[PDB]
C-alpha cells in the first residue's frame, strides 16, 4: 500500500505548504494556488479552503503528446479534468498607523 | 562500465565533489560552483 490519495477533502482549511494529494499519475491537476512537486504531489501555496472543480483542459503547446492528442479530437470534443484550488482566506496584509510624524 | 570519481577545485582549494564517468571516455573536467570563494570554477579529477 503506497498510501496515496486525497489528504485534504473539499471545504477543509489548509495552511501554506500543506500537501493536498499524492498521486502516481495526474489524477488531479493543480488549480489556483496549488503547486506541484517532482512526485506530482499537490501542495498548497496559500492559506484557505480546498475546492475541487471540473475545468477545460488546454495543455501546453510544448507538451507534444497532449498537443497531438488534442489535435486528434473531433470538432465536437472538449477535454475536461479535475482541478484542485485553494481559496485564500486571510487578506495578504493591512495598513496600520505606525507613527504620527 | 562507470566509475565513481572525485574532482578537486582549482580555486577555493580544499573543495571537492564526486560524480560518475565512463571507463573509456577522456579525463573529466567540469565547471562547478564552490562556496569557498562562492563562485563558479573548474574541477579536474584526481582519484577514481
Amino acid at each position: 500500500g503506497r498510501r496515496q490519495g486525497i489528504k485534504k477533502m473539499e471545504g477543509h482549511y489548509v495552511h501554506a505548504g500543506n500537501i493536498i494529494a499524492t498521486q502516481r499519475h495526474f489524477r488531479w491537476h493543480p488549480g489556483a494556488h496549488v503547486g506541484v512537486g517532482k512526485n506530482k504531489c499537490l501542495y498548497a501555496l496559500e492559506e484557505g479552503i480546498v475546492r475541487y472543480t471540473k475545468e477545460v483542459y488546454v495543455p501546453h503547446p510544448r507538451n507534444t503528446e497532449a498537443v497531438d492528442l488534442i489535435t486528434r479530437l473531433p470538432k465536437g470534443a472538449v477535454l475536461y479534468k479535475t482541478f484542485v484550488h485553494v481559496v485564500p482566506a486571510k487578506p495578504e496584509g493591512t495598513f496600520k498607523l505606525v507613527a504620527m510624524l | 562500465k562507470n566509475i565513481l570519481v572525485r574532482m578537486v577545485s582549482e580555486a577555493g582549494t580544499g573543495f571537492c565533489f564526486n560524480t560518475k564517468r565512463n571507463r573509456l571516455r577522456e579525463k573529466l573536467t567540469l565547471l562547478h560552483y564552490d562556496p569557498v570563494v562562492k563562485q563558479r570554477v573548474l574541477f579536474v579529477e584526481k582519484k577514481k
Partner: protein, 35 residues
C-alpha cells in the same frame, strides 16, 4: 450506486458512431479558441 447527470453531459450531442466522417481538430489554436 449511480446517479444520473443533472444537465447535459459534455460531449453528448456530438457523440456519433461515425467518428471517421466528422472533421477533426487540425490545429491546437482552434481547440484553444473553443476551449
Amino acid at each position: 450506486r449511480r446517479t444520473p447527470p443533472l444537465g447535459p453531459m459534455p460531449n453528448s450531442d456530438i457523440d456519433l458512431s461515425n467518428l471517421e466522417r466528422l472533421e477533426k481538430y487540425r490545429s491546437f489554436d482552434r481547440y484553444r479558441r473553443r476551449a
